[PDB]
Design a protein around this ligand. Structure first.
Ligand SMILES: CC(=O)N[C@@H]1[C@@H](O[C@@H]2O[C@H](C(=O)O)[C@@H](O[C@@H]3O[C@H](CO)[C@@H](O)[C@H](O[C@@H]4OC(C(=O)O)=C[C@H](O)[C@H]4O)[C@H]3NC(C)=O)[C@H](O)[C@H]2O)[C@H](O)[C@@H](CO)O[C@H]1O
Ligand SMILES: CC(=O)N[C@@H]1[C@@H](O[C@@H]2O[C@H](C(=O)O)[C@@H](O[C@@H]3O[C@H](CO)[C@@H](O)[C@H](O[C@@H]4OC(C(=O)O)=C[C@H](O)[C@H]4O)[C@H]3NC(C)=O)[C@H](O)[C@H]2O)[C@H](O)[C@@H](CO)O[C@H]1O
Ligand SMILES: CC(=O)N[C@@H]1[C@@H](O[C@@H]2O[C@H](C(=O)O)[C@@H](O[C@@H]3O[C@H](CO)[C@@H](O)[C@H](O[C@@H]4OC(C(=O)O)=C[C@H](O)[C@H]4O)[C@H]3NC(C)=O)[C@H](O)[C@H]2O)[C@H](O)[C@@H](CO)O[C@H]1O
Ligand SMILES: CC(=O)N[C@@H]1[C@@H](O[C@@H]2O[C@H](C(=O)O)[C@@H](O[C@@H]3O[C@H](CO)[C@@H](O)[C@H](O[C@@H]4OC(C(=O)O)=C[C@H](O)[C@H]4O)[C@H]3NC(C)=O)[C@H](O)[C@H]2O)[C@H](O)[C@@H](CO)O[C@H]1O
Ligand SMILES: CC(=O)N[C@@H]1[C@@H](O[C@@H]2O[C@H](C(=O)O)[C@@H](O[C@@H]3O[C@H](CO)[C@@H](O)[C@H](O[C@@H]4OC(C(=O)O)=C[C@H](O)[C@H]4O)[C@H]3NC(C)=O)[C@H](O)[C@H]2O)[C@H](O)[C@@H](CO)O[C@H]1O
Ligand SMILES: CC(=O)N[C@@H]1[C@@H](O[C@@H]2O[C@H](C(=O)O)[C@@H](O[C@@H]3O[C@H](CO)[C@@H](O)[C@H](O[C@@H]4OC(C(=O)O)=C[C@H](O)[C@H]4O)[C@H]3NC(C)=O)[C@H](O)[C@H]2O)[C@H](O)[C@@H](CO)O[C@H]1O
Ligand code: NI
Lengths: 273, 272, 271
């Protein structure tokens, strides 16, 4: 009779045991990341593999962040940890044939492209804002190129950390060391500073000022000007003088002495009373 | 019959209490697929007893492994005209923090980190890289290299203009030495300090122009200058022992006194 | 009864609802907040999304490591070759008024540390390469507040045990070049040293094995520690001390003084 209709409901309709309720669905969905944002509490691993990932500096990357339509930073990594077991950000490449950079910054804008600040510690310690090391003997550890009209390509300022004028007496703006190989080195013949102009310059090669006043320079011809009393702990070789304030050579002195001697001996030999 | 019905009423799922397939798709489409998607809000990482490691291969709250894939690991791009902060920020707050903000461990055949400042429409005072330290106990920056036949740091200044005098006020390296900005009474800091702690046979300073030696300071501190030079003051030197050595006042005075003595002796003792 | 019609309306059809097994298949394709492996591109396109610049809580991605060990982010590759760099930061508008990267570091080690490992063969590549085409600004700026060190410290280490191997190397190498495309020359300087506020220190101090060899003082006077040469004339002041270099004037005046004195004695002696 109507046992047909009841059997049809028993077959056609879904058991509550064999389907998730809306409450159970919400529990399961709430464990997944929404596209509108969320909090990840474990490791998110990216392992692209035949996934169409591109190198493009606009649309590429396993992660791409495009801030063109938004305020704010693309990415922020923050820690207030007292100590920990590794750095905040690591970039690593293992193959000697790897033919791309770890990091490329392609910057247009009106401020500094990369800005690195080491804040004042409570106790001074030997640590730097930037540490660069290379073990490649075929290349300069670091390269800088600029096109400045009226500034230095590299600008270094040393500021006295203290109000007292003698406090920084052992400091320098630039400090250079030249060392032998650490493990078993027999010495070194490396140079301190090498300056060239491959195409040739009209400028001074070295210009030293103090309170904006010229004190010492080396010109494009290699001649120097020194602004005060100076010393050579040794002999100085120079050209024979042709002007009043030119340094006299031993030859010039000896020739003038011999000329006077000859002239006087002649007068002495020939005078009469 | 009322038993069979009651059983249906209990065992079967209500339409109000279950999502349809259409509603399931709507809800799933709001969640990120492992195969990729577009996130439009903030993704926050807050690991906490989560087994996060420092390993430079498998560590990180985010780990990107590009070993089996072309492309960049990460790209941050903006075409915004202006904005309220930098693209990427790394920040550590504790002065006891004992790791770097960024570590680059590079093997390869090109430059590990490469920073380019493109030509602006109008020149302005901005840099590719700006470094500042307020730590008096350490050098703001350190560089170490092992070059066979190059500089550890190579700086090139290129004239921005075709005209040869345009860059006459520029330099490759510019150094300033200043007093403390707030209330400083002065400074005794040095410009350039060059040493060889282990000792070098090389020239300490070598200056060339068109690849030709013009001026140098040797490993012993002796200098060679390639043209006419000036001291606005006296120069102290050793007494000359060779023809082109500069003569001292003493050498001149001794030679004058020697001649004087010899002549006065002849004058005193001649007879007619 | 038509309680059967009410069951037909109130209850869900099996065809129109996912089973628990089908739900799990679909959920397993989505990222859990507890972690997982993404195998495609994750794109961030915030747009009126409340993204902030804050260096603590901002970013389209924010990683806070305050309550966890480990690194925030690791980018790793063991690829032999590839078609672009691991990480790229790019800004396109010349009006852009923020940095690409800002590091705000407190701590007791190096804020940024860049290492180029020993390659299998030497090649011309660097740990860091900096280039600017902005003529209005220094390509690079460094400021420090060192008590007793250099603001920039450069060390050259001999790559080889043999002492003459690195004879062409330097710690600092400077070149001064004309514009590559059509440049007629340059007047740029090599090294420019100043103290705008004025310093009592030596402007240039050169040592070898920690011993002073050559220096330029704050007044511009120099000291050289060994025999030296000028391929040219040296202009100096007239000497007033025994070891001062004599000028041509000093020599000529002393010669003329002796000459006069002798001619006078010669003119006036009797015997
Ligand atoms: C300092 C100095 O004088 N060094 C000499 C060295 O000159 C340098 O050459 C490099 C180089 O070409 O390898 C120059 O760097 C290039 O700079 C441009 C911007 O001007 C930059 O775009 C290049 O980066 C590439 O850019 C792009 C892109 O789409 O624009 C994509 C790539 O991912 C990226 O790598 C950059 N090239 C590299 C490889 O970094 C630098 O400006 C010069 O100073 C010279 O090559 C050698 C010759 O033997 O001598 C050195 O002394
Ligand atoms: C070509 C030549 O020899 N000119 C003679 C001139 O010498 C030049 O003096 C100028 C000067 O001081 O006016 C020097 O220009 C300075 O160069 C440095 C390094 O490139 C640069 O830092 C100076 O800029 C100042 O510093 C900074 C900064 O960020 O460090 C910013 C400001 O722009 C400024 O405060 C730059 N100064 C200027 C004003 O351009 C140049 O290097 C020297 O060659 C000499 O002084 C006079 C004779 O008294 O004759 C000229 O012919
Ligand atoms: C420029 C100069 O002369 N500085 C002197 C300074 O020497 C520098 O010492 C640092 C150092 O050890 O603190 C050297 O930096 C180390 O370089 C190695 C590569 O040779 C690099 O691997 C280190 O990084 C660590 O590496 C690893 C790893 O697994 O390999 C893990 C860590 O996360 C990472 O930190 C790097 N060390 C640091 C702390 O950055 C640098 O090469 C030297 O030039 C010397 O120590 C002091 C002594 O008073 O004097 C300075 O003048
Ligand atoms: C030890 C000594 O005194 N040698 C005498 C020699 O002086 C040397 O000259 C060489 C030379 O010019 O060949 C100098 O080598 C140059 O050094 C600089 C600094 O390290 C380096 O940049 C040069 O490399 C070239 O430069 C660049 C660059 O990017 O800057 C690109 C070129 O492709 C690259 O090869 C380097 N030149 C070479 C070829 O190695 C060295 O510094 C000087 O000491 C002197 O010229 C002769 C004649 O009197 O006698 C020798 O004994
Ligand atoms: C001598 C020299 O090397 N350059 C001279 C130059 O001095 C430099 O000025 C910059 C600058 O203010 O532009 C100084 O950099 C600032 O450093 C502070 C730390 O002391 C840092 O906080 C600034 O960054 C900002 O910081 C913050 C923040 O919340 O703290 C937020 C911003 O996002 C961030 O940008 C940094 N300012 C910058 C990068 O703009 C630098 O220390 C000085 O050496 C001087 O201005 C000019 C004068 O014409 O001459 C140069 O020669
Ligand atoms: C002010 C003055 O003229 N003093 C004379 C003095 O010369 C000074 O010598 C000191 C010295 O050697 O003690 C010099 O201090 C050195 O300066 C450099 C550059 O800033 C610095 O690197 C040295 O630090 C050593 O170097 C490093 C390093 O990483 O570079 C690591 C070591 O741990 C570190 O200590 C620094 N040396 C010290 C010990 O502070 C200073 O620059 C010179 O001006 C001269 O020696 C004597 C001769 O009798 O007279 C004084 O008046
Ligand atoms: Ni007589």
């Amino acid at each position: 009779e109507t046992n047909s209709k009841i059997t049809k409901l028993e077959s056609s309709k879904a058991d509550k045991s064999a389907v998730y309720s809306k409450a159970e669905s919400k529990i399961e969905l709430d464990k997944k990341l929404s596209l509108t944002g969320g909090i990840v509490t474990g490791q998110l691993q990216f392992k692209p593999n035949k996934s169409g990932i591109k190198p493009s500096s606009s649309v590429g990357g396993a992660i791409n962040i495009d801030m063109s339509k938004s305020e704010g930073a693309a990415m922020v990594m923050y820690t207030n940890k007292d100590t920990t077991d590794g750095p905040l950000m690591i970039l690593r490449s293992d193959k000697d044939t790897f033919d791309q950079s770890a990091q490329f910054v392609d910057y247009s804008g009106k401020t500094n492209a990369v800005n690195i600040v080491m804040r004042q510690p409570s106790a001074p310690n030997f640590s730097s804002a930037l540490n660069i090391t290379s073990a490649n003997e075929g290349g300069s550890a670091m390269q800088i190129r600029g096109v400045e009209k009226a500034l230095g390509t590299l600008k270094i300022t040393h500021e006295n950390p203290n109000v007292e004028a003698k406090y920084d007496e052992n400091a320098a703006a630039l400090s250079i060391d030249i060392v032998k190989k650490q493990k078993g080195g027999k010495g070194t013949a490396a140079q301190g500073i090498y300056i060239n102009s491959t195409s040739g310059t009209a400028g001074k090669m070295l210009r030293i000022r103090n309170k904006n006043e010229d004190k010492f320079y080396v010109g494009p011809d290699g001649g120097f000007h020194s602004g005060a009393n100076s010393t050579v702990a040794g002999n100085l070789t120079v050209k024979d003088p042709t002007s009043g304030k030119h340094a006299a050579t031993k030859d010039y002195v000896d020739e003038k002495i011999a000329e006077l001697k000859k002239l006087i001996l002649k007068k002495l030999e020939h005078h009469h009373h």
